[model samples]
Target: MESSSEQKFYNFVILHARADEHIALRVREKLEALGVPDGATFCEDFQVHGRGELSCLQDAIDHSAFIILLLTSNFDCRLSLHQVNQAMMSNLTRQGSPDCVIPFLPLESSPAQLSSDTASLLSGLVRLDEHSQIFARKVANTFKPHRLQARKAMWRKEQD
Candidate 1:
């Protein structure tokens, strides 16, 4: 809701090109299918529309726990409006919120297809491939703390 973002916090706020809406929506579905609540994910296709789109975008960015840039050839390579919001998210990352801006390389394209701005940004942060079942679960798992804790514990040696 666009009512009041001052106290609103979203688990995910997705940014993508119009060309990638299907993939973006698919990610939302997969994430939800993997157990992330539907309400926790925000997409302009699902939220931002009509008047106050820009303001609403800022609200979404300000309150997002994690921002996903669903990068593709259509995204940022052409005149991507989503790039502006991505920059806003980046501004937040620089302020010390840390690894919250993650770039996802979808199944349709190469990471190199992305612009240098996108590629350079990708250089520092971790990238997740659309193909990884394990990686996909790892992301959705983070939204639920207990599972992530279990995941972290999975790495420990069985005997001391």
Candidate 2:
């Protein structure tokens, strides 16, 4: 419930437009089953209430150790664009190394078909398509350990 930078509860935040909620939800469910704490996943639809929307989102990005971007045609919209920008900026400025931002191509849009900016953001990273259930499992496997470690660290901190 704390929104400070030091009070990071989520291990990763999913950045996507409202149009991609279903995909995000499925991913979140998969992550939860794969040892990711429910509190360690943040998304627009699952946001904490009372805080201003933009402020809460910024806090979420700042606090999370990783970011999952559901890249679809809808991501080119202004809101999603802003979220991506903030995530990139946060990665650049973060202490230690930058947090990971995994790009998931959840729709038919190819990297070439994406906006130049979006395409570039996803250029080098492996992009997971929505065509297979295995793709979700792949993603869950990719970040599950990191999420588990984050939860363990937080639990230790709480006990101290």
Candidate 3:
């Protein structure tokens, strides 16, 4: 199994701190509609149970072509340091790098209302938008290389 990113399916690993089923589902739906492949993975645990589970999530972090960090109103209060740290680390790693780890803010949450903690985390991230004409294209462009890379990797693996 080649781990190179040139395969056809760009597997995204969505990490959400809170276990809001509705929010997670909505985010997933948006990603899917944005042309993210269905093969992507997501972390569903509201609160990580143990170090082992955290490690597992970290592994997914390593494997993902892109990551979406969903920041909601209660993000800081409800989230743990480990989870917040992971999200921050992932964002930093992706910055100016090839991998995509976008920090998205839902419209419901006003930018002014973002807690100091959450604002600090979002300092450098691009604000997510739902308008298909603009942000959707941006999203599509970001994933394009990942998709292409996945395809190429799969092809190379087939030759072996």
Candidate 4:
């Protein structure tokens, strides 16, 4: 097992409704190609198992430096709503911190097309198009290694 310091800590959490899994997977793959670290966790419906699912998701939301929310037509499910609510609360509470909640809209949608509640929770919006490689690069750039390290250090200091 890798030591705590040696282990790749998650800096980004990908949150999406079941209908958006394919898009999330493609984005994850693109992020990997960009050489972002291996710790970006995808919080999909399948990950929720047994009784402690909510707690597990809470822990993930707390640890991540950023939350990538993929909005889709079927995003009104209970789990997706809960995750978005938690992410919004985290963003509000961590105002000046590095932790952020960003939204990725579908190729055909825009912030104006989103429901008021969903639009309110989103920070910067990125559109996912057919050639999402560029979008992936932009997303990957947001979590640059040095910036993430600095944020981690600051986060650790705040814990003490």
Candidate 5:
């Protein structure tokens, strides 16, 4: 086996409570259909028994162009709060406009309707939408290949 100079690009890294896998999977599928980069969206096909799995989570936060934090009643970012928390942590320490963590939520907002994990998520107030197509379109159109490359360059430059 040979690992060489191929580069990896992730337009979005979805962070969701395991309870919200159904929605996350749907969104991932939709994004894939929109021509996401290979290895861009994380999958569960591998069974390698090493820290690579853990590092994959860690790397996505640092490498993915955007961190998508899903929000809903049952969604707590529960399984990998590790990734989601540090996702927020990085943004807080970095400059404000430098923030890349994007929280996905619904359009209509009611203080009474909001609860639990969402309340803290709303503390960020970054709203997209829930529908996979609309959201996918939003994502697909929000940044094109050229723009992602620019963001990619900027991100790597920051690391150095």
Candidate 6:
């Protein structure tokens, strides 16, 4: 394992509705090409066969520094309502923290197209055609500030 200082660097977690394998794999490749930390380690779990795997899902969410939800056709249509409800609950419970969870839809998707509950949980948005470079940059840049802030918060707590 890397030292704490080195390991403290920000890492992102990419999440999808579990059936978006093709798009998710493509996005993962793009992130790796952009030099995101050990992109292969980015976490995700599948809800294949219509069963929600809680253990795997929890493990992925817990390991992630940030969460990114990818919206696609099968993701929007075939994913179970149980998973969506669980995700919404998780997001709401986690929103008190400084680190945010962002949602990105495909190029043709719109906020109006999503359910009201889903729209309300999304912190940031991006379109598919917006090039992975732009999105990766945003992810990297966002991580820097969060690390700085978290470090400062830890320092203050230490002095107390």
Each prediction's total of clashing residue pairs, residues at least 3 apart in sequence or on different chains, is 0, 0, 12, 0, 0, 0
Local accuracy of candidate 5 as per-residue lDDT tens digits, 1-160: 3379454456677665445566666666655666444323343333556555435654565566666656544454443345556545655544233245556653222233545655555455345465545666666655456656776776667566
| lDDT of model 6, residue 155 | 37
Which candidate has the top score in lDDT? 2
lDDT of 3 by residue, 1-160 (tens): 4477664433555444444445656666776787765434344553555553434544434445555555555343225235545654755654323234555555544445566765655555455654435668766766565663663464457666
As a whole number from 0 to 100, the lDDT of residue 54 in candidate 5 is 39
Candidate 6 ranges with C-alpha deviation above 4 Å:
1-12, 37-54, 76-98, 107-113, 123-133, 144-160
lDDT of 2 at 84: 49
> At residue 44, what lDDT does model 1 achieve?
43
Model 2 poorest 10 in a row by lDDT: 37-46
Q: 1 or 5: which has the higher lDDT?
A: 1
Residues 39-150, candidate 2: write the lDDT tens digits.
Answer: 3323454455644444555554555545566676755433554664565675556432333556666654445567777665665554655566676566566566765576
**lDDT value, candidate 4, whole model:** 0.54
Between prediction 2 and prediction 5, which has the larger TM-score? 2
What lDDT tens digits, residue by residue, belong to model 1 across residues 70-139? 6677565332235434556556654344455556667776678876676656655457567887756557
Q: What is the C-alpha lDDT of each candidate?
A: 0.54, 0.57, 0.52, 0.54, 0.54, 0.45
RMSD of 3: 6.1
Question: Which stretches of candidate 4 lie above 4 Å from their native place?
Answer: 1-8, 38-54, 76-99, 106-113, 123-137, 152-160
List per-candidate RMSD values in Å. Answer: 8.9, 5.4, 6.1, 5.5, 6.0, 7.2
TM-score of each: 0.60, 0.61, 0.58, 0.57, 0.55, 0.50
For candidate 4, write residues 1-160 as lDDT tens digits. Answer: 3365642456656665656666666656656666445345354465556443334544445666655655655444235446546655655565433335545555533445567766444443443332565766565566666656775776667555
